[PDB]
Amino acid sequence: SSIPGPGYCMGIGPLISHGRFLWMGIGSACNYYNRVYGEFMRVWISGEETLIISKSSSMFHIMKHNHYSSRFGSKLGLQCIGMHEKGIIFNNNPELWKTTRPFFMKALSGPGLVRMVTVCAESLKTHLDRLEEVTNESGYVDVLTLLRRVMLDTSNTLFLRIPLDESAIVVKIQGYFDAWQALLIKPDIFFKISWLYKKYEKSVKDLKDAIEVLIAEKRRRISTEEKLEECMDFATELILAEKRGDLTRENVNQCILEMLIAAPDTMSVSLFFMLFLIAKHPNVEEAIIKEIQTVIGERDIKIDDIQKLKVMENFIYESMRYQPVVDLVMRKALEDDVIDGYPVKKGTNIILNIGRMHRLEFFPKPNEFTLENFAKNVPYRYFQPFGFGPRGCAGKYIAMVMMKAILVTLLRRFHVKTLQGQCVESIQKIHDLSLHPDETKNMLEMIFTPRN
Ligand code: HEM
Ligand SMILES: C=C1C[C@@H]2[C@H](CC[C@]3(C)C(=O)CC[C@@H]23)[C@@]2(C)C=CC(=O)C=C12
Numbered sequence: 001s002s003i004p005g006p007g008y009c010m011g012i013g014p015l016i017s018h019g020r021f022l023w024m025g026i027g028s029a030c031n032y033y034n035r036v037y038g039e040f041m042r043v044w045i046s047g048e049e050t051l052i053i054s055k056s057s058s059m060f061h062i063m064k065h066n067h068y069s070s071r072f073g074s075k076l077g078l079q080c081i082g083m084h085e086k087g088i089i090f091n092n093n094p095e096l097w098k099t100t101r102p103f104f105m106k107a108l109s110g111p112g113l114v115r116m117v118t119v120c121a122e123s124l125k126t127h128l129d130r131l132e133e134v135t136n137e138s139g140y141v142d143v144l145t146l147l148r149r150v151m152l153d154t155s156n157t158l159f160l161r162i163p164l165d166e167s168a169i170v171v172k173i174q175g176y177f178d179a180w181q182a183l184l185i186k187p188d189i190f191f192k193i194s195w196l197y198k199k200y201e202k203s204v205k206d207l208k209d210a211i212e213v214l215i216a217e218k219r220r221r222i223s224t225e226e227k228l229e230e231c232m233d234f235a236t237e238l239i240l241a242e243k244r245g246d247l248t249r250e251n252v253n254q255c256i257l258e259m260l261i262a263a264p265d266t267m268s269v270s271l272f273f274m275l276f277l278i279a280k281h282p283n284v285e286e287a288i289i290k291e292i293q294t295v296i297g298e299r300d301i302k303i304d305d306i307q308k309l310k311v312m313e314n315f316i317y318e319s320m321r322y323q324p325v326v327d328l329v330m331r332k333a334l335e336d337d338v339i340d341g342y343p344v345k346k347g348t349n350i351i352l353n354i355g356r357m358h359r360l361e362f363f364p365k366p367n368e369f370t371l372e373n374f375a376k377n378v379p380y381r382y383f384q385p386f387g388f389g390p391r392g393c394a395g396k397y398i399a400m401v402m403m404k405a406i407l408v409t410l411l412r413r414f415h416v417k418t419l420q421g422q423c424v425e426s427i428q429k430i431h432d433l434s435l436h437p438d439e440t441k442n443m444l445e446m447i448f449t450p451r452n
Contacts, residue, residue, distance in 0.1 A: 001341035005033075005042035014044035021045060021185060027327060027431035030353050039360065040342065045185050046074070050349035054356040058340050060381050062331055062350060063389040070094065070332035070391075072349040076191045077183030081176070081204050086254040088394070089262075090184075094334065097391075099246070100255060104394040107159060107234040107259075113398045114303045116158055120405040121301050123153045128413060131448065140419070140445035143275060144437070145170065147268035147406075154402065155263045159234035160256060162214045162221075172210055173261050175203030181433040211257050234259055262395065266325055267402060269436045273323040274316065274407065275446060276427070277369060279418040284371060285411070287311045292408060306404050314374040316403050320385040322369040323424045327355025327435045329387055354384055355435070417447040 007013055021029040021043075030052045033043060039054040050072075053059065062068045070092050078084035078092075085093040088100050106112075127133070127150045134146045148170045156164060179200035191197060218235050222228070238252045278285045288311055295308045331350040338344065359366040362382035363373045386393035393399065410416075420443060428438045437444055 003042045003342055004038040004040065006037070014047065017043045018045055018185075018187065025430060025432035026185065026351075027355075027433075027435050030328060030351055031356060031431075034353055034356055039356075040340065045072075045349060046187055048072075048347065048349055049345075050351065051344070052351045052353060054353040054360060055340060056357055056361045056382055059352050059354065059357060059384065061339055062352060063329075063384070063387050063392060065337075066390050067335035067337065067346075068331045068333060068350070068391070069097070070334055071330045072332045073184045073330065074186055074188070076188060077186055080183050080191075080197070080201060081180045082208065082254050082257075083180070086251050087258040088255070089258055092332065096251075100251065101391075101394065103234065103237055103241070103255065104259070107237065108395050108398045112158065113401055116154070116398055117301065117303050117306065117401050117405050119158050120150075120154050120402050121409045123157065124150045124406050124409045126150075127153070128410070135448075136445065139447055141448050143272055143446045144268060144439070144444065147271055148173070148264045150406065151264040151267050152260065155260050159259050160214065160218060161233065162217050164214055169207075169210060169260075170264065172203070172207040173264050176207040176257075176261060177265055179203045184433060208253075208257065211260070212253065215253060215256055263402070266434070267399065267406075269325045269434065270320065271403060271406060272437070273325065273424050274319045274403070275410075275416055276418055276422070276424045277315075277319050277323065278411070279416050279446070280423045281369070284315060287371075288315060288407075288411060292412060296408065296412075301405060301408050305408075306401055309404055309408065311371070312404055312407060313400070314371050316400065316407075317374050317378075317383070317385065318369060318371055321358045321363070321373060321383065324355045324358070324385070325434050325436060326385075327431075328353055331391075354387075358383065358385075413451060414448040415451055417449060419443050419445055419447070 006017060009016070017033075020032070024032060033041060033052055034054050040058060041052055043050050043052060053062075071090050072092065073090060075084060078090055083090040085091055085096055088097055088104055091097040091100065127146060131141065134142045134149075136142075149166050152164075152170055152173065153166060156162070182200055183197065186197070215235070219239065222236060222239055235256050238247060238255055241247045242249055242252045278288075291309060291311045295305055329352040331352065333344050333346050333348040333350065336344065336346050344350075362378070365373055380388065386396035386399065388396075422443050427444070428441045430436055430438050
């Protein structure tokens with residue numbers, strides 16, 4: 001098998017496709033190219049050949065083997081946002097990534113994943129007793145903002161615990177995201193003409209400078225302190241590693257930033273799409289309340305409860321399957337290989353189109369939202385909402401805990417209504433790095449009406 005895809009127009013092949021990506025958006029460009037050509041095909045972002053793949057078989061191969069534990073993207077765009085060989089998310093240096101990930105992995109599982117289930121519920125309870133902060137005169141709640149705030153609160157009180165300006169940092173975090181999303185695949189030419197990008201350069205500084213203030217304090221409280229053994233957390237772990245010789249201060253700093261943004265960047269959008277799905281699916285929402293009555297009653301949500309919330313678990317999966325937020329994964333080939341039928345040279349960029357994959361394969365009723373798609377145990381090789389393997393989502397387990405926790409704590413207390421005939425299908429969406437709602441539009445509010 002030779003490689004499918006558009007004609008290489010003697011050096012015009014690349015230019016049309018890279019342009020198509022910038023004009024369309026990374027997400028909807030992938031969906032376009034996969035629809036036109038095969039579920040496996042070649043394109044050019046910048047110079048380098050890049051493959052876009054929805055085939056579950058290829059998907060599985062890639063996330064499984066160790067020679068795909070890299071991502072890709074403009075070096076100058078990454079340097080701009082500070083993820084060039086520094087975080088983990090888009091840290092593309094094999095060795096430096098290898099040595100940092102452990103820290104993330106430890107903090108996002110075991111003892112911490114148990115605190116998180118209650119840290120979440122409390123954080124949300126706080127914010128639900130302060131609805132005045134997010135509710136309109138006509139009772140319209142800004143769900144997106146509320147969520148982002150409890151996500152940041154949650155992340156902070158678990159991984160860093162330093163008092164911060166919640167409202168302020170959330171807006172800056174979004175500046176950071178947008179900037180990241182903008183510069184990720186902008187061709188080098190773009191960075192030469194400075195008044196075009198320096199817009200973004202400023203949102204990055206706004207967040208980084210806001211965070212240096214926080215880590216500066218965490219550094220003090222550590223260098224004083226009585227029983228240091230008593231209270232280990234993500235930020236401390238890193239700082240002490242730096243205090244040995246394991247980490248650079250710059251890197252530490254990026255990781256803390258990367259940990260704080262991660263939840264607000266994804267959970268909030270995901271739960272938002274989940275909340276709309278509940279409103280327009282009354283049948284499903286009844287099953288979820290019964291399960292809560294059966295499993296929890298009027299007791300505080302605890303770790304031992306989460307396995308029992310079976311219906312909800314399926315709801316979360318079906319929501320992510322049907323309305324994904326992270327619908328694509330970027331990887332790079334580190335060794336040569338043959339993947340399915342095709343030769344894949346090292347240095348080849350890969351975009352796994354997991355969103356399209358969850359509609360072309362396995363599932364009984366792919367194109368409608370039903371809890372029937374998850375009535376029979378799903379092979380983790382046909383459904384990858386987080387990815388798996390050496391570089392799968394580091395939060396994949398804690399994530400599910402948090403989502404379960406916040407949904408329970410919310411639906412426990414309020415019925416949710418969507419304005420007009422609005423639903424996830426009829427929301428206007430941007431489809432670039434992630435797949436999220438266009439916030440320059442409106443009608444994205446909800447109404448929270450009490451229960452009992
Ligand atoms: C429901 C929300 C979430 C979704 C849909 C999601 C999904 C994903 C996916 C698909 C990847 C790419 C993995 C791969 O390449 O196969 C990823 C990576 C990652 N995720 Fe998540 N995730 C979520 C929540 C979180 C949370 C809460 C955190 C941390 C608090 C987190 C931290 C990370 C990090 C640090 C990476 C980069 C991993 C690496 O390259 O080493 N994620 N996530
Ligand atoms: C929404 C996104 C986009 C995700 C990214 C991890 C790497 C992903 C999956 C890619 O290869 C392309 C889109 C990227 C993620 C989940 C990780 C952390 C975060 O803060 C925000 C994220």
